[PDB]
Amino acid sequence: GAMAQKNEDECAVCRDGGELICCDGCPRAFHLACLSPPLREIPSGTWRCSSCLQATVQEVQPRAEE
Ligand SMILES: [Zn+2]
Ligand SMILES: [Zn+2]
């Protein structure tokens, strides 16, 4: 189960703060230029880091009878 309400307000690249952006499902924080690829502007929605994109599992289709 665990819990992850309050996200981390500290970077994990240069250990610097200020204009930090924490991933949706990942409390981890990063800087615009630090991110790869770096973001030009702050997105207004659900942003996903590399970890999230790499956390994609093969979508299988159950019930394959007949
Ligand atoms: Zn950084
Ligand atoms: Zn993430």
PDB file of C-alpha atoms and ligand atoms in Angstrom:
ATOM      1  CA  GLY A   1       0.000   0.000   0.000  1.00  0.00           C
ATOM      2  CA  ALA A   2       2.327   2.728   1.264  1.00  0.00           C
ATOM      3  CA  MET A   3       1.570   6.439   0.926  1.00  0.00           C
ATOM      4  CA  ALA A   4       2.853   9.328  -1.187  1.00  0.00           C
ATOM      5  CA  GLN A   5       0.826  12.487  -0.565  1.00  0.00           C
ATOM      6  CA  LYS A   6       3.508  15.079   0.184  1.00  0.00           C
ATOM      7  CA  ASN A   7       6.028  15.119  -2.663  1.00  0.00           C
ATOM      8  CA  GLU A   8       9.728  15.893  -2.258  1.00  0.00           C
ATOM      9  CA  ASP A   9      10.653  19.571  -2.574  1.00  0.00           C
ATOM     10  CA  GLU A  10      14.309  18.794  -3.227  1.00  0.00           C
ATOM     11  CA  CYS A  11      16.104  18.139  -6.521  1.00  0.00           C
ATOM     12  CA  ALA A  12      17.908  14.847  -7.130  1.00  0.00           C
ATOM     13  CA  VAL A  13      20.289  16.120  -9.806  1.00  0.00           C
ATOM     14  CA  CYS A  14      22.096  19.195  -8.467  1.00  0.00           C
ATOM     15  CA  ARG A  15      20.589  19.127  -4.962  1.00  0.00           C
ATOM     16  CA  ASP A  16      19.311  22.652  -5.650  1.00  0.00           C
ATOM     17  CA  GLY A  17      15.838  24.049  -4.993  1.00  0.00           C
ATOM     18  CA  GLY A  18      13.716  26.991  -6.056  1.00  0.00           C
ATOM     19  CA  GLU A  19      11.908  26.314  -9.327  1.00  0.00           C
ATOM     20  CA  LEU A  20      11.425  22.583  -8.786  1.00  0.00           C
ATOM     21  CA  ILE A  21       8.952  20.297 -10.536  1.00  0.00           C
ATOM     22  CA  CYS A  22       7.979  16.979  -8.946  1.00  0.00           C
ATOM     23  CA  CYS A  23       6.650  14.159 -11.122  1.00  0.00           C
ATOM     24  CA  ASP A  24       3.007  13.127 -10.748  1.00  0.00           C
ATOM     25  CA  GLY A  25       3.390   9.559  -9.486  1.00  0.00           C
ATOM     26  CA  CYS A  26       7.021  10.169  -8.526  1.00  0.00           C
ATOM     27  CA  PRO A  27       7.654  12.432  -5.465  1.00  0.00           C
ATOM     28  CA  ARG A  28      11.146  12.955  -6.889  1.00  0.00           C
ATOM     29  CA  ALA A  29      11.921  16.511  -7.991  1.00  0.00           C
ATOM     30  CA  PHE A  30      13.981  17.776 -10.922  1.00  0.00           C
ATOM     31  CA  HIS A  31      15.002  20.971 -12.701  1.00  0.00           C
ATOM     32  CA  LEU A  32      13.951  21.989 -16.211  1.00  0.00           C
ATOM     33  CA  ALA A  33      17.477  21.999 -17.680  1.00  0.00           C
ATOM     34  CA  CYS A  34      18.399  18.988 -15.550  1.00  0.00           C
ATOM     35  CA  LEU A  35      15.664  16.836 -17.080  1.00  0.00           C
ATOM     36  CA  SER A  36      16.584  14.875 -20.210  1.00  0.00           C
ATOM     37  CA  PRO A  37      15.229  16.039 -22.492  1.00  0.00           C
ATOM     38  CA  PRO A  38      14.917  19.426 -20.693  1.00  0.00           C
ATOM     39  CA  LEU A  39      11.552  21.203 -20.642  1.00  0.00           C
ATOM     40  CA  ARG A  40      11.245  24.643 -22.234  1.00  0.00           C
ATOM     41  CA  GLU A  41       8.168  25.662 -20.243  1.00  0.00           C
ATOM     42  CA  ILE A  42       6.146  24.368 -17.284  1.00  0.00           C
ATOM     43  CA  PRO A  43       3.370  21.996 -18.506  1.00  0.00           C
ATOM     44  CA  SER A  44      -0.160  22.409 -17.157  1.00  0.00           C
ATOM     45  CA  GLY A  45      -1.221  18.811 -16.601  1.00  0.00           C
ATOM     46  CA  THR A  46       0.162  15.367 -15.793  1.00  0.00           C
ATOM     47  CA  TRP A  47       3.924  15.262 -16.322  1.00  0.00           C
ATOM     48  CA  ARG A  48       5.816  11.960 -16.226  1.00  0.00           C
ATOM     49  CA  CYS A  49       9.561  11.526 -15.748  1.00  0.00           C
ATOM     50  CA  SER A  50      11.798   8.910 -17.367  1.00  0.00           C
ATOM     51  CA  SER A  51      11.041   6.470 -14.550  1.00  0.00           C
ATOM     52  CA  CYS A  52       7.300   6.637 -15.252  1.00  0.00           C
ATOM     53  CA  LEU A  53       7.749   6.160 -19.003  1.00  0.00           C
ATOM     54  CA  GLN A  54      10.085   3.249 -18.265  1.00  0.00           C
ATOM     55  CA  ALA A  55       7.517   1.828 -15.845  1.00  0.00           C
ATOM     56  CA  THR A  56       5.288   0.708 -18.714  1.00  0.00           C
ATOM     57  CA  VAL A  57       4.296  -2.961 -18.746  1.00  0.00           C
ATOM     58  CA  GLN A  58       3.299  -4.936 -21.844  1.00  0.00           C
ATOM     59  CA  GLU A  59      -0.472  -4.530 -22.184  1.00  0.00           C
ATOM     60  CA  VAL A  60      -1.812  -8.071 -22.545  1.00  0.00           C
ATOM     61  CA  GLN A  61      -5.354  -8.948 -23.620  1.00  0.00           C
ATOM     62  CA  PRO A  62      -6.917 -11.548 -21.244  1.00  0.00           C
ATOM     63  CA  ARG A  63      -9.771 -13.885 -22.178  1.00  0.00           C
ATOM     64  CA  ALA A  64      -8.229 -15.320 -25.346  1.00  0.00           C
ATOM     65  CA  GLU A  65     -10.522 -18.353 -25.523  1.00  0.00           C
ATOM     66  CA  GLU A  66     -12.205 -19.542 -28.723  1.00  0.00           C
TER      67      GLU A  66
HETATM   68 ZN    ZN B   1      18.874  19.729 -10.691  1.00  0.00          ZN
HETATM   69 ZN    ZN B   2       7.867   9.843 -12.145  1.00  0.00          ZN
END
